[PDB]
Protein backbone atom coordinates (compact mmCIF):
# COMPACT_ATOMS: atom_id res chain seq x y z
CA UNK A 1 0.00 0.00 0.00
CA UNK A 2 0.72 3.95 -0.19
CA UNK A 3 0.46 4.62 3.12
CA UNK A 4 -1.68 3.45 6.17
CA UNK A 5 -1.39 6.03 8.87
CA UNK A 6 -2.37 3.30 11.55
CA UNK A 7 0.88 1.79 10.95
CA UNK A 8 3.30 4.13 9.78
CA UNK A 9 5.64 6.17 11.90
CA UNK A 10 6.12 9.61 13.15
CA UNK A 11 9.10 9.94 10.34
CA UNK A 12 7.30 8.72 7.43
CA UNK A 13 4.53 10.91 6.52
CA UNK A 14 5.43 14.18 6.07
CA UNK A 15 2.72 16.25 7.97
CA UNK A 16 3.47 19.77 7.76
CA UNK A 17 1.26 22.64 8.49
CA UNK A 18 1.64 26.24 7.79
CA UNK A 19 2.23 27.10 11.09
CA UNK A 20 3.31 25.50 14.01
CA UNK A 21 3.17 26.39 17.70
CA UNK A 22 5.69 25.05 20.47
CA UNK A 23 3.82 24.49 24.01
CA UNK A 24 6.02 25.95 26.46
CA UNK A 25 8.43 23.78 28.35
CA UNK A 26 6.70 22.82 31.67
CA UNK A 27 6.45 2.91 23.24
CA UNK A 28 6.51 7.14 22.43
CA UNK A 29 3.77 6.81 20.02
CA UNK A 30 1.53 4.90 22.64
CA UNK A 31 1.95 7.00 25.17
CA UNK A 32 1.51 10.07 23.67
CA UNK A 33 -1.69 8.79 22.11
CA UNK A 34 -2.32 7.92 26.24
CA UNK A 35 -1.78 11.70 26.63
CA UNK A 36 -4.35 12.97 23.60
CA UNK A 37 -7.08 10.94 25.51
CA UNK A 38 -6.53 12.98 28.70
CA UNK A 39 -6.17 16.04 27.15
CA UNK A 40 -9.66 15.09 25.39
CA UNK A 41 -11.56 13.97 28.55
CA UNK A 42 -10.00 17.15 29.82
CA UNK A 43 -11.51 19.15 27.34
CA UNK A 44 -14.48 16.92 27.71
CA UNK A 45 -15.50 17.60 31.56
CA UNK A 46 -14.49 21.25 30.80
CA UNK A 47 -16.46 21.72 27.99
CA UNK A 48 -19.27 19.43 29.71
CA UNK A 49 -19.70 21.99 33.17
CA UNK A 50 -20.21 25.37 30.76
CA UNK A 51 -22.62 23.43 28.64
CA UNK A 52 -24.64 22.61 31.68
CA UNK A 53 -24.18 25.91 33.54
CA UNK A 54 -25.92 27.67 30.24
CA UNK A 55 -28.65 25.19 30.69
CA UNK A 56 -31.54 24.36 32.79
CA UNK A 57 -30.56 21.38 35.46
CA UNK A 58 -33.74 19.15 33.97
CA UNK A 59 -32.95 19.68 30.61
CA UNK A 60 -31.46 17.11 28.61
CA UNK A 61 -27.60 17.68 27.29
CA UNK A 62 -26.19 14.78 24.90
CA UNK A 63 -23.04 15.22 22.55
CA UNK A 64 -19.52 13.27 21.65
CA UNK A 65 -17.14 15.48 22.93
CA UNK A 66 -14.63 13.49 20.35
CA UNK A 67 -16.54 14.47 17.96
CA UNK A 68 -15.88 18.48 18.49
CA UNK A 69 -12.55 17.95 19.44
CA UNK A 70 -11.86 15.67 16.00
CA UNK A 71 -13.78 18.92 14.36
CA UNK A 72 -11.74 21.39 15.79
CA UNK A 73 -8.10 19.82 14.92
CA UNK A 74 -9.11 19.32 11.64
CA UNK A 75 -9.61 23.12 11.99
CA UNK A 76 -6.57 23.64 13.55
CA UNK A 77 -4.34 22.17 10.26
CA UNK A 78 -4.85 25.83 8.63
CA UNK A 79 -4.59 27.92 11.95
CA UNK A 80 -1.88 30.26 13.27
CA UNK A 81 -0.69 32.72 15.73
CA UNK A 82 -2.85 33.12 18.44
CA UNK A 83 -5.75 30.98 16.90
CA UNK A 84 -3.38 28.24 16.49
CA UNK A 85 -2.16 28.62 20.12
CA UNK A 86 -6.10 28.99 21.42
CA UNK A 87 -6.79 26.12 19.49
CA UNK A 88 -3.97 24.11 21.46
CA UNK A 89 -4.91 25.86 24.87
CA UNK A 90 -8.27 24.99 24.85
CA UNK A 91 -8.71 21.29 23.53
CA UNK A 92 -5.51 20.71 25.85
CA UNK A 93 -3.36 19.70 22.98
CA UNK A 94 -0.88 21.65 24.69
CA UNK A 95 -0.78 19.49 27.81
CA UNK A 96 0.97 16.32 25.84
CA UNK A 97 4.97 16.61 26.51
CA UNK A 98 5.63 16.66 22.51
CA UNK A 99 5.74 20.47 21.45
CA UNK A 100 5.53 21.18 17.97
CA UNK A 101 1.49 21.13 16.90
CA UNK A 102 2.17 19.49 13.87
CA UNK A 103 2.64 16.50 16.11
CA UNK A 104 -1.15 16.68 17.50
CA UNK A 105 -2.62 15.46 14.08
CA UNK A 106 -0.15 12.42 14.04
CA UNK A 107 -1.40 10.78 17.39
CA UNK A 108 -5.24 11.33 16.58
CA UNK A 109 -4.69 9.88 13.31
CA UNK A 110 -3.19 7.06 15.60
CA UNK A 111 -5.98 7.26 17.97
CA UNK A 112 -8.61 6.97 14.79
CA UNK A 113 -6.80 4.03 13.79
CA UNK A 114 -7.13 2.33 17.19
CA UNK A 115 -10.97 3.48 17.52
CA UNK A 116 -12.39 2.83 14.46
CA UNK A 117 -9.91 0.91 12.27
CA UNK A 118 -10.80 -3.08 13.76
CA UNK A 119 -14.69 -2.76 13.36
CA UNK A 120 -14.90 -5.37 16.12
CA UNK A 121 -17.95 -7.37 16.67
CA UNK A 122 -20.91 -6.22 18.34
CA UNK A 123 -19.51 -2.88 18.83
CA UNK A 124 -20.25 -0.71 15.49
CA UNK A 125 -17.64 2.11 16.28
CA UNK A 126 -17.39 4.18 13.23
CA UNK A 127 -16.67 7.85 12.06
CA UNK A 128 -16.44 9.91 8.95
CA UNK A 129 -15.13 13.68 8.46
CA UNK A 130 -15.55 15.64 5.28
CA UNK A 131 -14.41 19.33 3.91
CA UNK A 132 -17.02 21.01 1.93
CA UNK A 133 -15.07 24.15 0.08
CA UNK A 134 -16.64 26.80 -2.46
CA UNK A 135 -17.22 25.03 -5.66
CA UNK A 136 -15.15 28.10 -7.31
CA UNK A 137 -11.87 29.11 -4.81
CA UNK A 138 -8.84 27.05 -4.87
CA UNK A 139 -7.85 25.11 -1.84
CA UNK A 140 -4.19 24.90 -0.71
CA UNK A 141 -3.34 21.17 -1.45
CA UNK A 142 -1.05 20.84 1.21
CA UNK A 143 -3.87 21.20 3.65
CA UNK A 144 -6.35 18.85 1.43
CA UNK A 145 -3.57 15.95 1.60
CA UNK A 146 -2.75 16.41 5.30
CA UNK A 147 -7.00 16.79 5.92
CA UNK A 148 -6.99 13.68 4.05
CA UNK A 149 -3.99 11.73 5.17
CA UNK A 150 -4.64 12.68 8.91
CA UNK A 151 -8.28 12.74 8.85
CA UNK A 152 -9.56 10.94 6.21
CA UNK A 153 -11.55 13.85 5.16
CA UNK A 154 -11.70 14.49 1.39
CA UNK A 155 -12.67 17.98 -0.50
CA UNK A 156 -16.43 17.96 -1.78
CA UNK A 157 -16.75 20.83 -3.82
CA UNK A 158 -20.28 22.62 -3.38
CA UNK A 159 -21.76 26.19 -4.77
CA UNK A 160 -21.64 27.72 -1.44
CA UNK A 161 -21.76 31.78 -3.52
CA UNK A 162 -25.09 30.70 -5.60
CA UNK A 163 -26.67 27.90 -3.92
CA UNK A 164 -26.10 28.11 -0.03
CA UNK A 165 -29.23 26.74 0.91
CA UNK A 166 -28.99 23.77 -1.50
CA UNK A 167 -25.53 23.40 -0.42
CA UNK A 168 -26.37 23.02 3.35
CA UNK A 169 -29.19 20.53 2.07
CA UNK A 170 -25.97 18.51 0.49
CA UNK A 171 -23.48 18.65 3.65
CA UNK A 172 -26.52 17.42 5.85
CA UNK A 173 -27.87 14.53 3.67
CA UNK A 174 -24.31 13.77 3.62
CA UNK A 175 -24.15 13.64 7.60
CA UNK A 176 -27.49 11.67 7.66
CA UNK A 177 -25.87 8.87 5.32
CA UNK A 178 -23.16 8.79 7.85
CA UNK A 179 -24.92 8.46 11.35
CA UNK A 180 -27.72 5.96 9.54
CA UNK A 181 -30.25 8.59 9.50
CA UNK A 182 -30.27 9.84 13.25
CA UNK A 183 -28.46 13.09 12.79
CA UNK A 184 -30.31 14.76 9.86
CA UNK A 185 -30.23 18.61 10.42
CA UNK A 186 -26.45 19.46 11.80
CA UNK A 187 -26.22 22.75 10.07
CA UNK A 188 -29.27 24.99 11.06
CA UNK A 189 -31.27 27.15 8.91
CA UNK A 190 -28.83 30.32 7.10
CA UNK A 191 -26.45 29.20 9.06
CA UNK A 192 -24.86 28.44 5.59
CA UNK A 193 -24.82 32.13 3.51
CA UNK A 194 -22.99 33.31 -0.04
CA UNK A 195 -19.60 34.35 1.34
CA UNK A 196 -19.41 30.76 3.07
CA UNK A 197 -15.94 29.67 2.45
CA UNK A 198 -15.73 26.21 3.67
CA UNK A 199 -17.61 23.88 6.00
CA UNK A 200 -15.68 20.98 7.93
CA UNK A 201 -17.54 18.29 9.57
CA UNK A 202 -17.17 15.54 11.75
CA UNK A 203 -19.51 12.45 12.52
CA UNK A 204 -19.46 9.21 14.70
CA UNK A 205 -21.90 6.43 14.75
CA UNK A 206 -21.92 3.76 17.76
CA UNK A 207 -24.29 0.98 17.79
CA UNK A 208 -24.00 -1.62 20.58
CA UNK A 209 -25.33 -4.72 21.79
CA UNK A 210 -25.50 -5.50 26.01
CA UNK A 211 -23.67 -7.92 27.31
CA UNK A 212 -26.26 -8.53 30.17
CA UNK A 213 -29.59 -7.51 27.80
CA UNK A 214 -32.77 -6.96 29.63
CA UNK A 215 -35.94 -8.84 28.49
CA UNK A 216 -39.16 -7.17 26.71
CA UNK A 217 -41.14 -9.24 29.40
CA UNK A 218 -39.71 -7.58 32.52
CA UNK A 219 -40.15 -3.95 31.21
CA UNK A 220 -43.10 -2.00 32.58
CA UNK A 221 -44.43 1.34 31.77
CA UNK A 222 -44.57 3.79 34.86
CA UNK A 223 -45.47 7.41 35.82
CA UNK A 224 -42.74 10.30 35.32
CA UNK A 225 -43.13 13.43 37.53
CA UNK A 226 -41.68 16.32 35.85
CA UNK A 227 -39.67 19.67 37.48
CA UNK A 228 -43.21 21.13 38.22
CA UNK A 229 -44.69 19.94 34.96
CA UNK A 230 -47.32 17.23 34.64
CA UNK A 231 -46.59 13.68 34.28
CA UNK A 232 -45.69 11.66 31.33
CA UNK A 233 -45.34 7.61 30.80
CA UNK A 234 -41.90 6.01 30.50
CA UNK A 235 -40.98 2.59 29.64
CA UNK A 236 -38.98 1.20 32.88
CA UNK A 237 -36.17 -1.64 31.98
CA UNK A 238 -35.43 -4.34 34.64
CA UNK A 239 -32.41 -6.94 34.89
CA UNK A 240 -30.59 -8.51 37.38
CA UNK A 241 -27.11 -9.26 36.75
CA UNK A 242 -23.30 -8.88 38.45
CA UNK A 243 -22.07 -5.63 37.05
CA UNK A 244 -19.19 -3.63 38.29
CA UNK A 245 -20.72 -1.20 41.09
CA UNK A 246 -19.56 1.63 43.36
CA UNK A 247 -21.37 4.23 45.80
CA UNK A 248 -19.24 6.40 45.90
CA UNK A 249 -19.25 10.46 48.28
CA UNK A 250 -22.43 11.24 49.57
CA UNK A 251 -24.71 8.01 47.84
CA UNK A 252 -23.55 8.64 44.30
CA UNK A 253 -24.24 5.91 43.05
CA UNK A 254 -21.66 4.72 39.90
CA UNK A 255 -22.50 2.01 37.45
CA UNK A 256 -21.28 0.35 34.50
CA UNK A 257 -22.84 -1.70 31.86
CA UNK A 258 -20.97 -3.18 29.60
CA UNK A 259 -20.82 -4.45 25.79
CA UNK A 260 -20.31 -7.69 24.02
CA UNK A 261 -16.30 -7.55 24.04
CA UNK A 262 -15.77 -5.30 27.20
CA UNK A 263 -13.85 -2.48 24.74
CA UNK A 264 -16.88 0.01 24.69
CA UNK A 265 -18.92 0.19 27.68
CA UNK A 266 -21.58 2.78 29.49
CA UNK A 267 -20.84 4.72 32.62
CA UNK A 268 -23.79 6.07 34.81
CA UNK A 269 -23.51 8.24 38.06
CA UNK A 270 -26.76 8.91 39.73
CA UNK A 271 -27.12 11.67 42.65
CA UNK A 272 -28.05 10.33 45.67
CA UNK A 273 -32.37 9.73 45.87
CA UNK A 274 -33.10 13.14 46.56
CA UNK A 275 -30.05 15.14 45.58
CA UNK A 276 -29.21 17.10 42.44
CA UNK A 277 -26.55 16.85 39.83
CA UNK A 278 -25.13 20.10 40.39
CA UNK A 279 -22.32 19.24 42.72
CA UNK A 280 -21.20 15.96 40.88
CA UNK A 281 -21.24 18.43 37.71
CA UNK A 282 -19.31 20.88 39.15
CA UNK A 283 -16.54 19.00 40.67
CA UNK A 284 -16.53 16.70 37.99
CA UNK A 285 -13.05 16.31 36.34
CA UNK A 286 -11.53 13.51 34.91
CA UNK A 287 -9.16 12.74 37.77
CA UNK A 288 -12.73 12.06 39.84
CA UNK A 289 -14.42 10.32 36.94
CA UNK A 290 -11.20 7.62 37.03
CA UNK A 291 -10.85 7.86 40.95
CA UNK A 292 -14.82 6.44 40.94
CA UNK A 293 -13.80 3.91 37.78
CA UNK A 294 -10.97 2.07 40.06
CA UNK A 295 -13.45 1.83 43.25
CA UNK A 296 -16.03 0.00 40.90
CA UNK A 297 -16.24 -3.68 42.10
CA UNK A 298 -18.46 -6.13 40.61
CA UNK A 299 -21.36 -7.11 42.57
CA UNK A 300 -25.05 -8.85 42.44
CA UNK A 301 -27.92 -5.66 41.71
CA UNK A 302 -31.34 -4.77 40.05
CA UNK A 303 -30.82 -2.28 37.45
CA UNK A 304 -33.79 -0.41 36.75
CA UNK A 305 -33.11 1.77 33.70
CA UNK A 306 -35.66 3.26 31.62
CA UNK A 307 -35.67 2.85 27.27
CA UNK A 308 -35.58 5.93 25.66
CA UNK A 309 -34.06 8.05 23.52
CA UNK A 310 -32.79 11.87 23.63
CA UNK A 311 -31.65 14.01 20.56
CA UNK A 312 -29.57 17.51 20.93
CA UNK A 313 -28.57 20.33 19.05
CA UNK A 314 -26.60 23.46 19.51
CA UNK A 315 -24.49 25.86 18.71
CA UNK A 316 -20.83 25.37 20.60
CA UNK A 317 -19.57 29.48 19.82
CA UNK A 318 -20.75 30.94 23.36
CA UNK A 319 -19.08 28.22 25.61
CA UNK A 320 -15.66 28.10 23.77
CA UNK A 321 -15.53 31.45 23.56
CA UNK A 322 -15.76 31.63 27.51
CA UNK A 323 -12.89 28.95 27.14
CA UNK A 324 -10.55 30.76 25.97
CA UNK A 325 -11.66 30.29 21.91
CA UNK A 326 -12.05 34.12 21.45
CA UNK A 327 -10.16 34.81 17.92
CA UNK A 328 -11.20 32.29 15.76
CA UNK A 329 -14.43 33.55 15.89
CA UNK A 330 -13.46 36.99 15.19
CA UNK A 331 -13.15 38.60 11.58
CA UNK A 332 -10.88 41.18 12.30
CA UNK A 333 -8.51 38.61 14.47
CA UNK A 334 -9.13 35.11 13.13
CA UNK A 335 -5.88 33.39 11.59
CA UNK A 336 -6.25 30.82 9.10
CA UNK A 337 -3.93 30.95 5.85
CA UNK A 338 -3.27 27.53 5.45
CA UNK A 339 -6.65 26.62 4.01
CA UNK A 340 -6.88 28.85 0.46
CA UNK A 341 -4.34 29.00 -2.18
CA UNK A 342 -2.07 32.36 -1.61
CA UNK A 343 -2.20 32.18 2.69
CA UNK A 344 -5.97 33.53 2.98
CA UNK A 345 -6.33 35.38 5.64
CA UNK A 346 -9.61 36.87 6.00
CA UNK A 347 -11.22 33.74 7.06
CA UNK A 348 -12.93 33.32 10.65
CA UNK A 349 -15.18 30.73 11.87
CA UNK A 350 -18.88 32.36 11.96
CA UNK A 351 -20.39 29.32 13.80
CA UNK A 352 -19.97 25.69 14.75
CA UNK A 353 -22.75 23.01 15.28
CA UNK A 354 -23.12 19.85 17.33
CA UNK A 355 -25.91 17.43 17.19
CA UNK A 356 -26.15 14.49 19.24
CA UNK A 357 -28.75 11.36 19.19
CA UNK A 358 -28.92 8.56 21.93
CA UNK A 359 -31.63 5.48 22.09
CA UNK A 360 -31.25 2.90 24.90
CA UNK A 361 -33.32 -0.79 24.92
CA UNK A 362 -33.71 -3.91 25.85
CA UNK A 363 -30.94 -5.02 23.11
CA UNK A 364 -28.41 -2.26 23.50
CA UNK A 365 -27.45 0.95 23.00
CA UNK A 366 -27.19 3.02 19.76
CA UNK A 367 -25.53 6.55 19.38
CA UNK A 368 -24.49 9.40 17.36
CA UNK A 369 -22.79 12.85 16.79
CA UNK A 370 -21.87 15.50 14.63
CA UNK A 371 -19.93 18.18 14.40
CA UNK A 372 -19.43 21.18 12.06
CA UNK A 373 -17.51 24.23 12.10
CA UNK A 374 -18.96 27.08 9.39
CA UNK A 375 -15.96 28.96 7.87
CA UNK A 376 -17.48 32.76 7.08
CA UNK A 377 -21.12 32.16 7.29
CA UNK A 378 -23.71 33.82 9.26
CA UNK A 379 -23.68 33.96 13.06
CA UNK A 380 -27.19 33.28 14.43
CA UNK A 381 -28.84 32.76 17.89
CA UNK A 382 -28.82 29.72 19.54
CA UNK A 383 -32.68 28.15 19.04
CA UNK A 384 -32.52 26.78 22.59
CA UNK A 385 -35.81 23.67 22.84
CA UNK A 386 -35.63 24.00 26.73
CA UNK A 387 -37.49 20.74 27.96
CA UNK A 388 -37.65 20.41 31.45
CA UNK A 389 -38.23 17.23 33.13
CA UNK A 390 -36.80 16.11 36.78
CA UNK A 391 -34.40 13.73 38.45
CA UNK A 392 -31.51 13.54 36.24
CA UNK A 393 -28.55 11.37 35.88
CA UNK A 394 -25.54 11.47 33.67
CA UNK A 395 -24.53 9.15 30.84
CA UNK A 396 -21.27 8.11 29.33
CA UNK A 397 -20.27 5.71 26.66
CA UNK A 398 -16.72 5.34 26.56
CA UNK A 399 -13.80 2.73 24.94
CA UNK A 400 -11.98 1.19 27.83
CA UNK A 401 -8.23 0.44 26.23
CA UNK A 402 -7.82 3.93 25.02
CA UNK A 403 -9.30 6.11 28.05
CA UNK A 404 -11.90 7.76 25.76
CA UNK A 405 -15.13 9.77 26.30
CA UNK A 406 -16.77 8.81 23.07
CA UNK A 407 -20.21 10.51 23.97
CA UNK A 408 -21.26 12.19 27.24
CA UNK A 409 -24.99 13.45 28.75
CA UNK A 410 -27.22 14.24 31.17
CA UNK A 411 -30.71 12.28 31.05
CA UNK A 412 -33.70 14.18 32.97
CA UNK A 413 -36.43 13.14 30.57
CA UNK A 414 -37.20 9.41 29.96
CA UNK A 415 -40.50 9.96 28.93
CA UNK A 416 -41.79 9.37 24.57
CA UNK A 417 -42.67 12.59 23.06
C1 LIG B 1 -25.14 5.77 2.59
O1 LIG B 1 -24.94 5.56 1.18
C2 LIG B 1 -24.55 4.25 0.85
C3 LIG B 1 -24.56 4.21 -0.68
O2 LIG B 1 -23.69 5.11 -1.25
C4 LIG B 1 -25.52 3.18 1.40
O3 LIG B 1 -24.82 1.93 1.28
C5 LIG B 1 -25.58 0.87 0.72
O4 LIG B 1 -25.83 -0.04 1.80
C6 LIG B 1 -26.33 -1.32 1.49
C7 LIG B 1 -26.37 -2.12 2.78
O5 LIG B 1 -26.75 -1.38 3.88
C8 LIG B 1 -25.33 -1.95 0.49
O6 LIG B 1 -25.63 -3.31 0.20
C9 LIG B 1 -24.54 -4.19 0.33
O7 LIG B 1 -23.84 -4.16 -0.91
C10 LIG B 1 -22.65 -4.92 -0.73
C11 LIG B 1 -21.49 -4.48 -1.50
O8 LIG B 1 -21.45 -3.42 -2.42
C12 LIG B 1 -20.23 -3.29 -3.08
O9 LIG B 1 -20.30 -4.13 -4.24
C13 LIG B 1 -18.98 -4.48 -4.68
C14 LIG B 1 -18.59 -5.78 -4.02
O10 LIG B 1 -19.70 -6.36 -3.38
C15 LIG B 1 -18.08 -3.26 -4.36
O11 LIG B 1 -16.86 -3.34 -5.05
C16 LIG B 1 -18.91 -2.04 -4.69
O12 LIG B 1 -18.15 -0.85 -4.85
C17 LIG B 1 -20.02 -1.86 -3.63
O13 LIG B 1 -20.21 -0.76 -2.88
C18 LIG B 1 -19.29 -0.07 -2.12
O14 LIG B 1 -19.17 -0.70 -0.85
C19 LIG B 1 -18.39 0.03 0.08
C20 LIG B 1 -18.12 -0.98 1.17
O15 LIG B 1 -17.95 -2.27 0.67
C21 LIG B 1 -19.26 1.24 0.46
O16 LIG B 1 -19.24 1.81 1.71
C22 LIG B 1 -18.17 2.45 2.30
O17 LIG B 1 -17.52 1.49 3.15
C23 LIG B 1 -16.31 2.01 3.73
C24 LIG B 1 -15.62 0.85 4.40
O18 LIG B 1 -14.23 0.82 4.02
C25 LIG B 1 -16.71 3.13 4.69
O19 LIG B 1 -17.56 2.62 5.73
C26 LIG B 1 -17.57 4.14 3.81
O20 LIG B 1 -17.87 5.26 4.78
C27 LIG B 1 -18.66 3.61 3.15
O21 LIG B 1 -19.19 4.63 2.30
C28 LIG B 1 -19.48 2.14 -0.78
O22 LIG B 1 -20.68 2.90 -0.57
C29 LIG B 1 -19.61 1.39 -2.07
N1 LIG B 1 -18.84 2.12 -3.12
C30 LIG B 1 -19.34 2.35 -4.36
C31 LIG B 1 -18.40 3.02 -5.29
O23 LIG B 1 -20.41 2.03 -4.62
C32 LIG B 1 -23.08 -6.41 -0.74
O24 LIG B 1 -21.96 -7.25 -0.76
C33 LIG B 1 -24.00 -6.68 0.44
O25 LIG B 1 -24.66 -7.94 0.29
C34 LIG B 1 -24.60 -8.83 1.35
O26 LIG B 1 -25.67 -8.59 2.23
C35 LIG B 1 -26.97 -9.09 1.95
C36 LIG B 1 -27.89 -8.67 3.08
O27 LIG B 1 -27.89 -9.67 4.07
C37 LIG B 1 -26.89 -10.62 1.72
O28 LIG B 1 -28.17 -11.17 1.55
C38 LIG B 1 -25.99 -10.79 0.52
O29 LIG B 1 -25.88 -12.17 0.14
C39 LIG B 1 -24.58 -10.28 0.83
O30 LIG B 1 -23.93 -11.19 1.70
C40 LIG B 1 -22.81 -11.83 1.15
O31 LIG B 1 -23.24 -13.09 0.66
C41 LIG B 1 -22.17 -13.81 0.04
C42 LIG B 1 -22.76 -14.94 -0.77
O32 LIG B 1 -22.77 -14.54 -2.12
C43 LIG B 1 -21.18 -14.23 1.16
O33 LIG B 1 -20.17 -15.05 0.64
C44 LIG B 1 -20.66 -12.95 1.78
O34 LIG B 1 -19.76 -13.20 2.86
C45 LIG B 1 -21.78 -12.06 2.30
O35 LIG B 1 -22.39 -12.63 3.43
C46 LIG B 1 -25.10 -5.62 0.54
O36 LIG B 1 -26.10 -5.90 -0.42
C47 LIG B 1 -25.31 -1.09 -0.80
O37 LIG B 1 -24.42 -1.70 -1.73
C48 LIG B 1 -24.76 0.26 -0.40
N2 LIG B 1 -24.72 1.15 -1.58
C49 LIG B 1 -23.64 1.24 -2.39
C50 LIG B 1 -23.79 2.16 -3.54
O38 LIG B 1 -22.68 0.64 -2.20
C51 LIG B 1 -25.95 3.46 2.86
O39 LIG B 1 -27.11 2.68 3.15
C52 LIG B 1 -26.32 4.92 3.01
N3 LIG B 1 -26.73 5.19 4.41
C53 LIG B 1 -27.91 5.78 4.72
C54 LIG B 1 -28.22 5.80 6.17
O40 LIG B 1 -28.60 6.21 3.92
C1 LIG C 1 0.14 25.62 1.19
O1 LIG C 1 0.58 25.40 2.55
C2 LIG C 1 1.91 24.89 2.54
C3 LIG C 1 2.21 24.52 3.98
O2 LIG C 1 1.21 23.76 4.56
C4 LIG C 1 2.86 25.97 2.00
O3 LIG C 1 4.18 25.43 1.91
C5 LIG C 1 5.14 26.10 2.69
O4 LIG C 1 5.78 27.07 1.83
C6 LIG C 1 6.55 28.02 2.54
C7 LIG C 1 7.47 28.70 1.54
O5 LIG C 1 7.62 30.06 1.76
C8 LIG C 1 7.37 27.31 3.63
O6 LIG C 1 6.82 27.66 4.91
C9 LIG C 1 7.51 25.80 3.44
O7 LIG C 1 8.41 25.54 2.35
C10 LIG C 1 6.21 25.12 3.12
N1 LIG C 1 5.79 24.16 4.15
C11 LIG C 1 5.54 24.45 5.44
C12 LIG C 1 5.75 23.34 6.41
O8 LIG C 1 5.20 25.49 5.74
C13 LIG C 1 2.39 26.50 0.62
O9 LIG C 1 3.06 27.73 0.34
C14 LIG C 1 0.90 26.77 0.61
N2 LIG C 1 0.48 27.01 -0.80
C15 LIG C 1 -0.22 28.11 -1.16
C16 LIG C 1 -0.24 28.40 -2.61
O10 LIG C 1 -0.76 28.76 -0.39
C1 LIG D 1 2.64 34.75 13.55
O1 LIG D 1 2.51 36.14 13.30
C2 LIG D 1 3.69 36.86 13.04
C3 LIG D 1 3.30 38.31 12.84
O2 LIG D 1 2.14 38.67 13.49
C4 LIG D 1 4.31 36.29 11.73
O3 LIG D 1 5.48 37.06 11.44
C5 LIG D 1 4.64 34.81 11.97
O4 LIG D 1 5.14 34.22 10.77
C6 LIG D 1 3.39 34.08 12.39
N1 LIG D 1 3.63 32.66 12.65
C7 LIG D 1 4.50 32.17 13.56
C8 LIG D 1 4.71 30.70 13.49
O5 LIG D 1 5.04 32.84 14.32
C1 LIG E 1 -13.46 -8.00 15.65
O1 LIG E 1 -14.33 -9.14 15.70
C2 LIG E 1 -14.98 -9.43 14.50
C3 LIG E 1 -14.94 -10.95 14.35
O2 LIG E 1 -15.77 -11.42 13.35
C4 LIG E 1 -14.36 -8.77 13.27
O3 LIG E 1 -15.14 -7.59 12.97
C5 LIG E 1 -12.87 -8.44 13.29
O4 LIG E 1 -12.12 -9.47 12.65
C6 LIG E 1 -12.33 -8.27 14.69
N1 LIG E 1 -11.40 -7.10 14.68
C7 LIG E 1 -10.07 -7.23 14.52
C8 LIG E 1 -9.23 -6.11 15.03
O5 LIG E 1 -9.62 -8.15 14.02
Same mark, same amino acid.
Given at each position: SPVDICTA +???? $??????CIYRSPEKEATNRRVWELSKANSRFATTFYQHLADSKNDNDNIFLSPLSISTAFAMTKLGACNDTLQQLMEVFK??? $??? +?????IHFFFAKLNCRL?? !???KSSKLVSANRLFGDKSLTFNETYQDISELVYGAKLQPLDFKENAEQSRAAINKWVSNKTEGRITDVIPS?? $??????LVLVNTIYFKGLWKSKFSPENTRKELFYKADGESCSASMMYQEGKFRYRRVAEGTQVLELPFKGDDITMVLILP !??? !???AKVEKELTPEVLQEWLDELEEMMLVVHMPRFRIEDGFSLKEQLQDMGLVDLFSPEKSKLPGIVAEGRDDLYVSDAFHKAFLEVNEEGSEAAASTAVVIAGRSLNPNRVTFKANRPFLVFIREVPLNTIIFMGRVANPCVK
Open positions: +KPRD $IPMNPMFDT $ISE +KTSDQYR !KANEA $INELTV !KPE !KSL
